[PDB]
Design a binder for this molecule. Structure first.
Ligand SMILES: [K+]
Ligand SMILES: [K+]
Ligand SMILES: [K+]
Ligand SMILES: [K+]
Ligand SMILES: [Mg+2]
Ligand SMILES: [Mg+2]
Ligand SMILES: [Mg+2]
Ligand SMILES: [Mg+2]
Ligand SMILES: [Mg+2]
Ligand SMILES: [Mg+2]
Ligand SMILES: [Mg+2]
Ligand SMILES: [Mg+2]
Ligand SMILES: [Mg+2]
Ligand SMILES: [Mg+2]
Ligand SMILES: [Mg+2]
Ligand SMILES: [Mg+2]
Ligand SMILES: [Mg+2]
Ligand SMILES: [Mg+2]
Lengths: 48, 112, 62
RNA sequence: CAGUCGCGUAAGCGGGGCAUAGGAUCACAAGAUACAAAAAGGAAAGAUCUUGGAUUUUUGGAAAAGCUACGCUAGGGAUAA
RNA sequence: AUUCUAUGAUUAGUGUGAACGAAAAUAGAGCAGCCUAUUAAAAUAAGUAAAAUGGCUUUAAAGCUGUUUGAAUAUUGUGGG
């Protein structure tokens, strides 16, 4: 209940995602990850 | 990558290497040893610089001009296979994998 | 090998069954592993069997 | 090994944490894959890959309270009168 | 056309599982077609097909069914699968 599992959706609209955990009483996650569909580092943002 | 070491060695005062004895040292010497070479002419290393060189697109053509042999030779990493002797598979499913247990192949085949 | 026909035959009393177990009194289910779940239930069956694929008769030039 | 990113003058290091304490399948749900599509064109329901919700805590994974001095059967006598 | 036997088939499939389990087709036994039925029957079928719901059977189709409802009229493409 204290920790939630979020989904970091790629901003290349390729449908790839990364799942990381973070506390509810925190800000949304945002990272620069490697999208294997386009094979390039793009911006991944939390789903909601 | 290959390391090419540029060495600068000082000769002792009043010691001039014979122009014909220097071109004889490299004769029939395919493993040039700086250690031995330095000890024979009584030289001393003073300066040094370094620069490496690996296989690149222009390597093949550079060998053609100067006739350097060895272009059509590629090196592959030596692979070490396991030293464990083969062993019979173990498990309930692994035993019952031959045509004998054809009626139990629904428990043994197509396992994820 | 005719079991149950004397001690000297080598297959005499127990008939190669041991001594008073479940394998001597009755029969064990073949799929049974003692209770431990099988790997096809712990991993599951992988894939499907294509029932529409054509069964060609392979012929080579050799 | 391939892909492509960070740091570093460079060499190089990086597939979480100094090490040792967080369970599958099935079902269900969200993405991708383009495999098959029961006449045919689609679809449904399936298949592969990734991921999520479990005191599945009897943690190789049942939805589960007692009494019989009226007790029954098959056994052992792990000592129970 | 039906019936009987085997194969198809520890198959497709169903089911958490344990298990359950077709059809097409093939071979054999028999063979037979009709409404003017070789023993006397239809003016071609309406509360029917079907739908909702409760069950049966089952793979979700087809089939059986209580309750409440309720169609169309031939390849000049009407109706079932
Ligand atoms: K035996
Ligand atoms: K005995
Ligand atoms: K099956
Ligand atoms: K029906
Ligand atoms: Mg003996
Ligand atoms: Mg034995
Ligand atoms: Mg025994
Ligand atoms: Mg158990
Ligand atoms: Mg179709
Ligand atoms: Mg169809
Ligand atoms: Mg246990
Ligand atoms: Mg264990
Ligand atoms: Mg004792
Ligand atoms: Mg049959
Ligand atoms: Mg009619
Ligand atoms: Mg009906
Ligand atoms: Mg229909
Ligand atoms: Mg009908």
């Amino acid at each position: 209940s204290r920790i939630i599992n979020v989904r970091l959706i790629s901003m290349a609209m390729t449908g790839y995602f990364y799942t990381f955990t973070r506390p509810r009483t925190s800000l949304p996650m945002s990272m620069l990850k490697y999208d294997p569909i386009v094979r390039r580092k793009v911006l991944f943002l939390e789903q909601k | 990558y290959h390391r090419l070491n540029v060495f600068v060695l000082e000769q002792k005062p009043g010691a001039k290497i014979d122009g014909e004895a220097l071109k004889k040292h490299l004769e029939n010497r395919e493993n040039f040893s700086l250690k031995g070479f330095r000890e024979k002419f009584d030289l001393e290393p003073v300066g040094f610089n370094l620069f490496r060189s690996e296989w690149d697109e222009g390597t093949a053509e550079v060998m053609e001009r100067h006739g350097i042999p060895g272009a059509e030779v590629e090196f592959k990493r030596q692979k070490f296979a396991s030293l464990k002797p083969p062993r019979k598979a173990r498990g309930w499913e692994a035993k019952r994998q031959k045509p004998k247990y054809k009626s139990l192949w629904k428990y043994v085949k197509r396992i994820a | 090998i005719r079991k149950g026909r004397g001690p000297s035959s080598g297959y005499g009393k127990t008939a190669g069954r041991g001594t008073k177990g479940q394998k001597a009194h009755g029969h064990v289910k073949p799929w049974f592993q003692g209770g431990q779940t099988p790997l096809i239930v712990s991993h599951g069956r992988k894939g499907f069997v294509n029932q529409f694929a054509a069964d060609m008769s392979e012929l080579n030039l050799e």
